[PDB]
Amino acid sequence: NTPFVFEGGRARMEFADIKNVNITTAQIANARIQWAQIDNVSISNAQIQNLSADKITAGSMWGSNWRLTVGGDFVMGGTGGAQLWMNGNRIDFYDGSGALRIRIGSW
Amino acid sequence: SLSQYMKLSEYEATWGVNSTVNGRYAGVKLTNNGTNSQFQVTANKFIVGDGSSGNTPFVFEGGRARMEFADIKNVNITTAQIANARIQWAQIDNVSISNAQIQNLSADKITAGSMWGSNWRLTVGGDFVMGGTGGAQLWMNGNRIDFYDGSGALRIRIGSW
Amino acid sequence: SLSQYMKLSEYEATWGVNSTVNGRYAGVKLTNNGTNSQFQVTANKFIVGDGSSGNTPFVFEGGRARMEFADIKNVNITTAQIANARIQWAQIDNVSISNAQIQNLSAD
């Protein structure tokens, strides 16, 4: 095996153990990390067990039984298929048949 | 031995180079004790130059392996300092981040100071404020839900008056 | 003929010092076939020791490039296992995270 191959300007390595790496550009297919400190990130998909954040700018939000739309509709589901639909004009309570039972706000 | 007190011994085909000048040891000791072949470069600077451009795109210097490019299938790292990092699949046990831009965030628990959509905000104080059509605004917290109209006039209050 | 080692054929200059002890091919084979030169260290341990302290702060051992420090301008990696990682800019197609602490989190 050639588990170090410096070829064509590229240090190919099958394994490495680096105590202290500076990197200018990484292209990492898989990355387990115990303690990161990231000044800026873009991410396509995250799966975070315990997120903490000082400010969250969110487009849409979705839980198992609620959603906050990009438009600002906070919709929560209820027992029996009931639904609170809330936005900056009104709170609507729908029942499990989809019938509006209470409106509070702009009619 | 047509080499310098290094030649090749039986047990250790010691291609030493062992440049000893002013008590600085340099070498290339290809030892092979037949169990561990050790190619010990001893140098303040190990270089791989490319055989084409005289670029030195591997330079180990002063304890530091400098690389112009690398292709590492597996890397343990104790400390990274990465200026730019594209990553296809991360698994991060702990992270601090100063700015994030996440297309699809899933999370089991979100501790949050303030939260801000295009037409809503949940403040650090616990005021959830949604904007509405015409500049209307539902402002709610654990004391009340207030509906303001497009002129900022309170139209409905529910909770503490 | 070269005892401690070498071989210039018209088509390949093999600077191959092939330390073959106990069937461990140690070597360093600088081939040059005039199209590709290859400096093949073959070693259980390619060490770069500093010529100063006898520290070995590059040690290619057992298929693993051990590095006390490194400065890599452009690393492709297939699998990282990073104990601590400061990163100034990242672009992460997928991530699982156990704990995050994010000062400003934009998300679609």
Author numbering:
A (entry chain EA): 216 to 322
B (entry chain EB): 162 to 322
C (entry chain EC): 162 to 269
Cite, word for word, the article reporting this structure.
Escherichia coli phage SU10 belongs to the genus Kuravirus from the class Caudoviricetes of phages with short non-contractile tails. Here we show that the virion of SU10 has a prolate head, containing genome and ejection proteins, and a tail, which is formed of portal, adaptor, nozzle, and tail needle proteins and decorated with long and short fibers. In contrast to other short-tailed phages, the tails of Kuraviruses elongate upon cell attachment. After binding to the host, SU10 tail, nozzle proteins, and short fibers re-arrange to form a nozzle that extends the tail.
The virion of bacteriophage SU10 has a prolate head with a length of 1430 Å and a diameter of 460 Å, which is formed by the major capsid protein (gp9). The tail is 220 Å long and decorated with six long and six short tail fibers. The tail is attached to one of the vertices of the prolate capsid, where the dodecamer of portal proteins (gp6) replaces a pentamer of capsid proteins. The part of the portal complex protruding from the capsid enables the binding of the dodecamer of adaptor proteins (gp11). A hexamer of nozzle proteins (gp17) is attached to the adaptor complex and enables the binding of six short tail fibers, trimers of short tail fiber protein (gp16). The tail needle, which is formed by three polypeptide chains (gp18), protrudes from the central channel formed by the nozzle proteins. In the SU10 virion, the short tail fibers are tilted towards the capsid and the tail needle protrudes from the tail complex. The 260-Å-long tail needle protrudes 200 Å from the nozzle complex. The cryo-EM density of the genome in the SU10 virion was resolved in both fivefold symmetric and asymmetric reconstructions of its head.
